[PDB]
Amino acid sequence: IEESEKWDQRLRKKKQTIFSDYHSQASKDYNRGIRDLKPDYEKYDKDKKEEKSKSRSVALYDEAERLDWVSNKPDKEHVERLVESIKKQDQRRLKNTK
RNA sequence: GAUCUUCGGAUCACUUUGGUCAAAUUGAAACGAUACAGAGAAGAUUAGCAUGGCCCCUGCACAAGGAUGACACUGCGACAUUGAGAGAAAAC
């Protein structure tokens, strides 16, 4: 059944994936791009577990009056994958248009 | 110096310099000519009025003229891709 349920997910989206307006196109493009995302590397879990042991005050997930979220400077790999993803999307657009 | 005053002094008047810049090749403009093309509307000849502004010229002009003054008048991708097949690859 599990294989059929996987096919049920396929057919449900296949009839749901088959231009109307910009408002709906926004969400469709966004989650289509999300489908190509590969999250959850070794950075996030270490960040969650390490400074929480010495969390004297405020939480790492607290954002009511946090200040360090202004100065989040990412690493090389993340911005590299960003440029590569945007380049791939541009390639897809230019191969689709003509 | 003039006036008094009494030979102590008092009156009267009191600070310039119009500077596109020191006697003209090298800090007031704008070009002649020769050589090239060489006069708007989808055949041909040709009326014009406009639109745009780091383009102006003549004019006292918010008239009007200067070739309808001249130049300009186009053109592209917030396209989602799936619709499918095939050989591969890694995968139903």
Ligand SMILES: [K+]
């Ligand atoms: K004419």
Ligand SMILES: [Mg+2]
């Ligand atoms: Mg005129």
Ligand SMILES: [Mg+2]
């Ligand atoms: Mg004109």
